Write a protein that binds this DNA or RNA. Structure first.
Ligand SMILES: O=C1C(c2[nH]c3ccccc3c2O)=Nc2ccccc21
Lengths: 327, 295
DNA sequence: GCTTGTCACGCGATGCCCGAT
DNA sequence: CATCGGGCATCGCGTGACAAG
């Protein structure tokens, strides 16, 4: 042996004792390097010191055993209902805490994120923005964060509150951001099975739907009875498309064929979905009887391209908005 | 320069940074444990930290600490309802600071019983049949006066019932429920123009987004409502006469000026030009198209 | 087949401790 | 009451083995 080896062995013994005490599963602990052992022990101590200040049940007129177990898991239930993750960031941009569900959304392990700089997770072009949120108290903003499953834009809804019990040097507590991060939302139904999801609808002469196939029910989201009890299809059509569809309805009335037309239909979710469609007239004894429209769902990109290259110019062509539908 | 020398220097400085970070973490530990900061070398700091962590002690936080952080971040209260009947299986105590309701008013109750009747249908939509999320907006009753309702944004998910690890005793009220799925959710409180489409009664059925810039409301805050509800009482019958006249004069345009209550509850003078959309086969009125402009 | 990082080790410059002045 | 040399412990440095990616 030798004194250097002896001192290093003492240090490593204490480091292993610290590691075994970390509140993580043993498979996570065994893979930790020594620097992360120290970092996570400091993390745990800072968390406990804060909760000693900040923190501390079913109403007894309400208490059942089952409700008591649910109460014991209330925090996890909240975390699962978040649809995202908890983040708490210090003034020094260190991640005071991140919930485990961050791995579900960005692919980063909780034990790797905690007590590291938050900018390592944030897009460069957005980093500055985040800093201005770290420094009258509520916060609601958007930031793109690294996604190892690559970036995902996330809504941050949070608050600036004093992070007590940090023993900075004796400095007063600094404001930390307590935020919840969730993904973003698009308002258009794009078919995943985009290829050849052709569906057909049957209509009265005024375009009131009377029949729908299974793929139509899947795309639009209406039951067959729901689809036919909402007035003519002009109630389903985007306001930026109604005049074009009306022109093409006239063309079909006059020639029996509508030609290809691209327009947006209102789904049962009150979402818009692009379709390229062709409306044909069926005849009974040489008189128009009903319409058979055959439609292919389009991605938003293809729809925007078609609208950009549109033939006629009609009012409201570039309008965007939301709609509802009754009966 | 020499590739071997630069490799060596980069490596030496990497190891130096590693040593410095180890020292910094040990200093943090000395700040974080009791008798230390009240001076010690590395070994005693590490031993005192081991002792303090043994005192304090698998999740990094307890369930209560996690809940504390979530509610500190963005308020809210948890509720767990069953999907078949809306039956409230669980509600957190946070319902008292959110809705000014005791926990006792949601237990033995139904989510339909707690929302506005105009919303009950919508609720069914959300309760019928990543991780199958649910995200909606409703109106929940509050303490009070008279019936008092507040808009509540709800974020949740569908979960197979009963939940794992929770004991369901034989004599528990939940033993004979037999619900198969449950919604687990959080409820939280809170000079241009735009086009719109209405039915002949005046109900907003299509709203251009520019409404936000024109009158301050989001499109969802107008759709389903009658435009007359936003109009000054001394202009309401004028607006109604315009709506009933535009129907008689299909194709013809009709203009009307009236006071529209912006979302700041402020009166803005608006000029609305309206006309009917005719079904190109039956010539029936599909809807009324309005262009609403600031004046 | 290279890059970055972890871990141990050898090695002195000080540190602490404490009989002996 | 200090000051002073022993010998071991602490502590920072650079380098080499090794491995994940
Ligand atoms: O396919 C349609 C179409 C249409 N399809 C639908 C399917 C379901 C509900 C409503 C509609 C609807 O309104 N309206 C048109 C006008 C001119 C050319 C083609 C079409």
């Amino acid at each position: 042996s030798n004194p250097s080896k002896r001192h290093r062995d003492r240090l490593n013994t204490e480091l292993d004792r610290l590691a075994s005490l970390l509140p993580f599963p043993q498979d996570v602990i065994n893979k930790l390097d020594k620097l992360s052992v120290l970092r996570l022990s400091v993390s745990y101590l800072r968390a406990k010191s804060f909760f000693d200040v900040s923190l501390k049940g079913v109403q007894d007129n309400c208490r059942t055993k089952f409700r008591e177990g649910l109460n014991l898991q209330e925090g996890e239930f909240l975390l699962q209902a978040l649809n995202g993750f908890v983040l708490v960031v210090t003034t020094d941009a260190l991640v005071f805490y991140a919930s485990s569900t961050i791995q579900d959304y960005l692919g980063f392990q909780q034990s790797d994120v905690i007590h590291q700089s938050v900018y390592e997770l944030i897009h460069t072009e957005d980093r500055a923005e985040f800093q201005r949120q770290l420094h009258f108290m509520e916060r609601c903003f958007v930031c793109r964060l690294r996604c190892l499953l690559g970036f995902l834009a996330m809504n941050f809804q949070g608050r600036l509150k004093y992070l007590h019990g940090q023993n900075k040097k004796i400095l007063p507590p600094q404001l930390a951001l307590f935020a919840i991060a969730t993904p973003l939302q698009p308002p258009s139904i794009l078919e995943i099975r985009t290829k050849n999801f052709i569906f057909r609808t049957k209509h009265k002469l005024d375009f009131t739907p009377t029949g729908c196939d299974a793929k139509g029910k899947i795309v639009l989201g209406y039951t067959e009875a729901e689809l036919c009890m909402r007035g003519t299809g002009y109630q389903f059509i985007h306001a930026a498309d109604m005049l074009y569809c009306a022109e093409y309805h006239v063309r079909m009335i006059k020639t029996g064929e509508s030609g290809m037309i691209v327009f947006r239909l209102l789904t049962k979710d009150n979402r818009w979905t692009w379709v390229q469609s062709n409306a044909r007239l069926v005849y009974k004894n040489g008189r128009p009887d009903y319409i058979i429209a055959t439609q292919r769902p389009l991605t938003d990109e293809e729809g925007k391209e078609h609208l950009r290259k549109r033939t006629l110019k009609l009012p409201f062509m570039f309008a965007t908005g939301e709609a509802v539908l009754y009966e | 320069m020499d590739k071997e020398r630069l490799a060596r220097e980069n490596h030496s400085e990497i190891e130096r940074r590693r040593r410095n970070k180890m020292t910094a973490y040990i200093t943090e530990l000395s700040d974080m444990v009791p008798t230390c900061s009240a001076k010690p070398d590395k070994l005693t700091i590490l031993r005192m930290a081991v002792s303090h962590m043994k005192s304090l002690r698998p999740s990094f936080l307890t369930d209560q600490e996690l809940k504390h952080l979530i509610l500190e971040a963005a308020d809210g209260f948890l509720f767990i309802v069953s999907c078949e009947t809306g039956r409230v299986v669980y509600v957190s105590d946070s319902v008292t600071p959110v809705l000014n309701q005791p926990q006792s008013e949601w237990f033995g109750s139904t989510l339909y019983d707690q929302v506005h009747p105009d919303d009950v249908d919508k609720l069914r939509e959300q309760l019928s049949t990543m991780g199958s999320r649910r995200s909606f907006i409703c109106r929940m009753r509050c303490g009070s006066g008279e019936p008092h309702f507040v808009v509540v944004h709800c974020t949740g998910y569908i979960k197979a019932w009963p939940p794992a690890g929770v004991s369901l005793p034989d004599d528990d009220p939940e033993a004979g429920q037999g619900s198969k799925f449950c919604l687990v959710a959080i409820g939280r409180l809170q000079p241009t123009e735009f086009i719109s489409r209405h039915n002949i009664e005046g109900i907003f059925t299509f709203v251009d987004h520019r409404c936000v810039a024109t009158v301050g409301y989001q499109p969802q805050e107008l759709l389903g409502k009658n435009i007359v509800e936003f109009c000054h009482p001394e202009d309401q019958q004028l607006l109604r006469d315009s709506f009933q006249q535009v129907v008689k004069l299909k194709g013809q345009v009709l203009s009307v000026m009236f006071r529209f209550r912006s979302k700041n509850q402020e009166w803005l003078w608006m000029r609305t030009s309206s006309f009917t959309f005719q079904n190109p086969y039956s010539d029936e009125i599909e809807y009324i198209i309005c262009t609403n402009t600031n004046v």
